[PDB]
Amino acid sequence: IPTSIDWRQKGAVTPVRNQGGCGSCWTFSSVAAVEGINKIVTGQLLSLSEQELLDCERRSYGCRGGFPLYALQYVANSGIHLRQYYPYEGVQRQCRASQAKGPKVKTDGVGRVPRNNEQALIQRIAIQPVSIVVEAKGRAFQNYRGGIFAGPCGTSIDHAVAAVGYGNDYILIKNSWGTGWGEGGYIRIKRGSGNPQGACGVLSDSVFPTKNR
Ligand SMILES: *[C@@H](C(=O)O)[C@H](O)C(=O)N[C@@H](CC(C)C)C(=O)NCCCCNC(N)=[NH2+]
Secondary structure, three states: OOOOOHHHHOOOOOOOOEOOOOHHHHHHHHHHHHHHHHHHHHOOOOOEEEEHHHHHHHOHHHHHHOOHHHHHHHHHHHHHEEHHHHOOOOOOOOHHHOOOOEEOOOOOOEEEOOOOOOHHHHHHHHHOEEEEEEEEOOHHHOOOOOOOEEEOOOOOOOOEEEEEEEEEEEEEEEEOOOOOEEEEEEEEEEEEOOOOOHHHHHOOOOOOEEEOO
């Protein structure tokens, strides 16, 4: 694998989103992962509907939180519509999937990275973007502006985000707090933490969509 990778520089990452006040991070990280594998295997970069997951993925709780694993299973079972045909409202409404216009992206399955294993996560990011988790509630994380973030942060994971790259000392992560946070919406989290769960719990729980060429 390469010493560094950046899926943005392979055209597999869409612009940064802003989830707003809604506790919908689980829809953003999962969609970013799906957009990534879809570009990798089809050649097209599409912007996909977080709102569809928010409304339609029954085992999650809309703006009250959710489960990236189940979001990815939904995409493998039902597919997902384009954002432009099922736009983000930042509030849960009735599922309108069957009424949405336009094409669908359908994946074939879901994989899981062996947890608390930095090399396993890096190896997976070398292949595709990954939906991961971090503890984002800390003031240092909330106030992050740039550079390599090492903390202070605990490992009580609370926020789903998408890993879209790495380099020797960092994992590169697409957050859903708009471009006004961090590095145009991105954060670099240090590799090589003393925590088995990694810095900010970044190694705690990582899943990804699978889709065949
Ligand atoms: C994250 C956010 O919007 O910042 C959002 O709160 C969320 O989905 N968090 C997940 C975090 C995990 C580490 C993936 C979460 O807390 N999921 C469990 C949600 C359970 C909510 N239950 C009810 N009844 N609302």
